[PDB]
Symmetry: none
Subunit: 211 residues, 2 copies
Amino acid sequence: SQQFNAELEDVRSHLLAMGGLVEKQVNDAVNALIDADSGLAQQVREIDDQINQMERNIDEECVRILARRQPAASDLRLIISISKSVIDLERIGDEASKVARRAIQLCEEGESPRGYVEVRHIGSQVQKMVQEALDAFARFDADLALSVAQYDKTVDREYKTALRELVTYMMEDPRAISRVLNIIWALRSLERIGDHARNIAELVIYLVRGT
Amino acid sequence: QFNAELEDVRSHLLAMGGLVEKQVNDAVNALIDADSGLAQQVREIDDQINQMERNIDEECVRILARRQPAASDLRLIISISKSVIDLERIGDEASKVARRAIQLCEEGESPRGYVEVRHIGSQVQKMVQEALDAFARFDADLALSVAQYDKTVDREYKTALRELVTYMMEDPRAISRVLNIIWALRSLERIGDHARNIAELVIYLVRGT
């Protein structure tokens, strides 16, 4: 041991580094959509490969660590929280990358007459949820983690009311359907990003509380 | 010991996979046939699926508690735990398809989309069955064929969407019904990505990368 806990901090810090890269993808995707910025949107998709390769590198790392002799219960909880959470980070990065596709599409089609304030609002919240879940993991802080998980309720709630606004608007202005659907798909991806931040928070709870 | 609990966990996985395939089949059929009873069946199983997932995940964690496994054994258990998340996501997307089927029963049938739902639905159903069969037999050839087919589903989804959108502008009164077909199609495409994910676990376990 006891350099087993070095290699353990190394995989913890690799998680954090992945999370940081993914959080920046969320930031850039949202800005891309709002700013009708194709270049920024493409830059986000091109990161998604590095993110997938980070996830693979972390999974193998968890494998090697585990392979060396049985971990104590708390350590096992940590490795398990890491390997499940890189899946969440990967799915966050993939959703970011879908938002960036919507961004490009809206550049081609013209802006939606509705939904930008909602995208920005939900996006900034869900990006916060990601920072907080990572900060919570980084500090074994199951208090913060709990509130993240709880805030997901209000995000899903905001999503359903924005959907209402946007569907009823589509029925009033059918010419805008293609553009409104793009905002709606982007909002659905932002909601999922918040669902995954919540999952990573719940893993931090399990890690800390033991359950 | 490992061999025994591995077969235990593998045995629960295959049962879970079997229900989920039936869920997808029931949910696609519910939509095409306007059959809300069958959609109800999809939603019922979904609770069992989530149970199986939780159980299977606990078993994996206990197995990881126990030994010190060879790397290759760790890979396998970690991949099993991943694959049950995919199976749960598939189950959940099937439930969404069922919900859409119910709404459509209420609204009367959409003027458009059922041909594409049958088409994409049957392909994605096949992808799941093959992904699971490939996993059951560690057949990496089959796995790779599944993963690569996803691109054609995504392509078919994108052309279906374009045509359904333009149709909704030609006929605004169908908006609510057509949106339901679109949401269902979104779930099916998602089911395809999850079958692709399971097939890719097989490729990784067999070929390394």
